[PDB]
RNA sequence: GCGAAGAACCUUACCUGGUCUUGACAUCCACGGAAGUUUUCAGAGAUGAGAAUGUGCCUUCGGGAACCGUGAGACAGGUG
RNA sequence: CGGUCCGGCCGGGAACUCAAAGGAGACUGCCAGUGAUAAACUGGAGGAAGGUGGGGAUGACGUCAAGUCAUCAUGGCCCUUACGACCAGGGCUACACACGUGCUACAAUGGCGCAUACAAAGAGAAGCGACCUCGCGAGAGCAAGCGGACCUCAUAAAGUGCGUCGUAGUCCGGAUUGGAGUCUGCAACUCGACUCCAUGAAGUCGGAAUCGCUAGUAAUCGUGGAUCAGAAUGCCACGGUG
């Protein structure tokens, strides 16, 4: 829940995710956004999101789906 | 024959009516003990009413509107003394000695700055 | 306030009248998705995201005279401090000091 | 005994006998007492057949006790082994409920001298 | 379904407009029900006089005007036919809806 | 320099003809909730009689006339110096203080109902055994010091 | 709990990464187009390119008003 | 005053109340004493009330090295392929550390669920949303009335009844940790608001450092609205009890 209608990704990112597997053994795709919800339609792979300075690698989990990538990627420093 | 009086107190207003007959007291279409809740002393409606002998020969009828239920009792006392001062042309003088003819001039406050309603002037700063 | 706020605001009101204002009662069926009716409105709902600049409003309405978005009374259309200045000049009819 | 499945409490209070076990809390007890039409007071001794086992589908409707009790052993690596904000904010005195960190951290951040 | 409004700035002007409107009502047909006044209201607006902050110093301005609603007890537009052709002083405003 | 407006008059009790017996409805009052403050007034005197109370129609006088204070504390200035003295209590306050010590003995202390605590303290006042409270020990502990002035 | 009668987008400062430079806003002069509507492709998006369609208003038959994309010499612009 | 099984329910009216408007009343005026037989003060009388009658409007030379150029104008002043500003995202709710202000529990005058009582002031036709319902519930339905003294939010709480439980580290308390719903939007990771079911260390009206208050005052419990897709426990407004 955020949201009850159901989350979505934008067409320029959908075009990349539907061509990301393939083998799933390549270098992490720069998806940039920390807002993306890891809801059960999403495929299990490693992706990279922006922290404001660089990109950080994170995994699309199967033990839980009720999350957004900002709950796993740290975006603030020194605190 | 009817004796009549009116009183205002703490945003309530009363009308009091007295007739000859058999003794009773009626308020807002019920008996007196069934109004004002459980009471502390129940005495301000009785204060002047003893002076013409309590529930002996007078038929007492009351209607009262507005304010808190304590204010309605105060409005009734002035309605009783406004009726008693025309029951005998000498009775007002003994009611004066007891203070039952006096009225307050203490109405609701306006702003006036800085006040929450009537007190608590700003915040009294910090140590 | 900027002079661009006089055109930009009313262009964004014309945007709302193009895409949302005559579609506001229909929001109880097009933006409803599942709670009522059936699965037939998802291609119709693409209109709710057809523009991309202002969604439910993206702005606040301003006092014309001062250009300010807050501190103004809609019973006059005017900034509340300027309502007292115009009252001290005797320019607003029926409005005067208390006494008191 | 056995008022909402295979329960082992005997001569406990009418409202509080299945508390602190993922079993049956006070508001659910107050609801089933009124649905069974039985006394809501003191320790149970008088109980008949056809009263409350015939109403199990209010008090034990889907999940109770072992269905939710001790369920952390397989939900811990997503917190302690996967890098996440809530994991660091399990191992440090930093709050998550939107409260202040500049003010009155005490003690919640540990000692102090 | 028939709605009437009368607005003025003075307690004599609200009556001298009521007087012509109730004469128009009586002339249109006898009814003996009495026109609706409903309570006149006023409003006041507090302002802070310091050019930045300070709420411990105020000033107070108030605006007073009179409102009446009249009400017609009949459903028929022949009851307002001449009322919608009436001329009054500039200091009063009338608004009629059918 | 004691400058205040004239003291506040009240009327005598309609049943007992006294302005002091009219005071019991203000004792053990909180939140301005005088409604519940009267709910233990005269209604505990039978509970008291069913312990050790005697003369139930006047068993309330023990907190007015059977337990009475007389000494107050502490200081008097004499030029540039301060010295300890035992002072006198004003006669109306002196009759109306033992009925007021009861707050710690009923809310900070005591078993079951506030009415039973009221009867508990009125039992002890009939034999003057009342357990001392902070609002009495803040005077009584110091009242026997400096018996030689300056 | 102070301007702030209210910041997920805005606002908006400050900061990051993009982009433009006579300017988002105003005006003096021309060029090609009415203002627009419908809509796809690339890009985070502004934009940058595609697939189509208008000619109305006012008026001495001339020509304007208005407004979109362009460009100098004057000159704008800043919650500095 | 009338219709009337005996309620403003209805003819119909205008006393109280409310909302409006005018005019009276209190003037040290009357008496005494005091005072400088002046100004003035205190009692007594009458009165609703006396004593600049009460409360409001409000303030000089200078002071505080006051406060504000972002409410307005404006000197000098910084910036120009830019400090212009358009776009997508972040931040203004950071926390090695210090201190105010608001509030709850510890119950017993109580907690919680039902029964019953009184407002004041506002605001609402793509809204406020009734009654009657669905549901553990926020809320949403079946859908009326209403352009606001007419319909609606709406229910005054403290109080008074009725049940349950009761000095128990407690049926409470809450740190600590989660789930399942309800609302607004394109979308609430980040910086939004309600509800239900669980998790369960401490909690005996209290450290340094300490406040406001002389009476309708201290105290305590209620209600609206602005800003607005959209948040109030803050702020402006309006009342019981004491």
Curated annotation (Swiss-Prot), chain A:
Belongs to the universal ribosomal protein uS19 family. PROSITE patterns: RIBOSOMAL_S19. This is Small ribosomal subunit protein uS19. NCBIfam families: rpsS_bact. One of its GO terms (molecular function) is rRNA binding. One of its GO terms (cellular component) is cytoplasm. It comes from Escherichia coli (strain K12). In the E.coli 70S ribosome in the initiation state it has been modeled to contact the 23S rRNA of the 50S subunit forming part of bridge B1a; this bridge is broken in the model with bound EF-G. The 23S rRNA contact site in bridge B1a is modeled to differ in different ribosomal states, contacting alternately S13 or S19. In the 3.5 angstroms resolved ribosome structures the contacts between L5, S13 and S19 bridge B1b are different, confirming the dynamic nature of this interaction. Bridge B1a is not visible in the crystallized ribosomes due to 23S rRNA disorder. Protein S19 forms a complex with S13 that binds strongly to the 16S ribosomal RNA. Contacts the A site tRNA.
UniProtKB/Swiss-Prot annotation, chain C:
One of its GO terms (cellular component) is small ribosomal subunit. Pfam families: Ribosomal_S14. Transmembrane segments: none annotated. Signal peptide: none annotated. InterPro entries: Ribosomal_uS14, Ribosomal_uS14_bac/plastid, Ribosomal_uS14_CS. GO terms for molecular function: rRNA binding; structural constituent of ribosome; tRNA binding. Gene3D superfamilies: 1.10.287.1480. NCBIfam families: PRK08881.1 (NF006477). Binds 16S rRNA, required for the assembly of 30S particles and may also be responsible for determining the conformation of the 16S rRNA at the A site. This is Small ribosomal subunit protein uS14. The gene is rpsN.
From Swiss-Prot, chain D:
GO terms for biological process: cytoplasmic translation. Part of the 30S ribosomal subunit. Forms a loose heterodimer with protein S19. Cross-links to the P site tRNA and weakly to the A site tRNA. Forms two bridges to the 50S subunit in the 70S ribosome, contacting the 16S rRNA and proteins S19 and L5. One of its GO terms (molecular function) is rRNA binding. Located at the top of the head of the 30S subunit, it contacts several helices of the 16S rRNA. One of its GO terms (cellular component) is cytosolic small ribosomal subunit. This is Small ribosomal subunit protein uS13. Belongs to the universal ribosomal protein uS13 family. Keywords: Ribonucleoprotein, Ribosomal protein, RNA-binding, rRNA-binding, tRNA-binding. Gene3D superfamilies: 1.10.8.50, 30s ribosomal protein s13, domain 2. It comes from Escherichia coli (strain K12). Residues 93-113 are annotated as: Disordered. The gene is rpsM.
From Swiss-Prot, chain F:
Disulfide bonds: none annotated. GO terms for molecular function: mRNA binding; rRNA binding; structural constituent of ribosome; tRNA binding. Changing residue 34 to A/E: Defective in ribosome assembly. One of its GO terms (cellular component) is membrane. GO terms for biological process: cytoplasmic translation; negative regulation of translation; ribosomal small subunit assembly; translation. Keywords: Ribonucleoprotein, Ribosomal protein, RNA-binding, rRNA-binding, tRNA-binding. Belongs to the universal ribosomal protein uS7 family. The strain K12 sequence is shown. Has been predicted to contact the N-terminal domain of IF-3 based on footprint studies; exactly how IF-3 interacts with the 30S subunit is controversial. One of the primary rRNA binding proteins, it binds directly to 16S rRNA where it nucleates assembly of the head domain of the 30S subunit. Is located at the subunit interface close to the decoding center, where it has been shown to contact mRNA. Has been shown to contact tRNA in both the P and E sites; it probably blocks exit of the E site tRNA. Part of the 30S ribosomal subunit. Contacts proteins S9 and S11. Cross-links to IF3 and the P and E site tRNAs. This is Small ribosomal subunit protein uS7. The lineage of its organism: Bacteria, Pseudomonadati, Pseudomonadota, Gammaproteobacteria, Enterobacterales. The gene is rpsG.
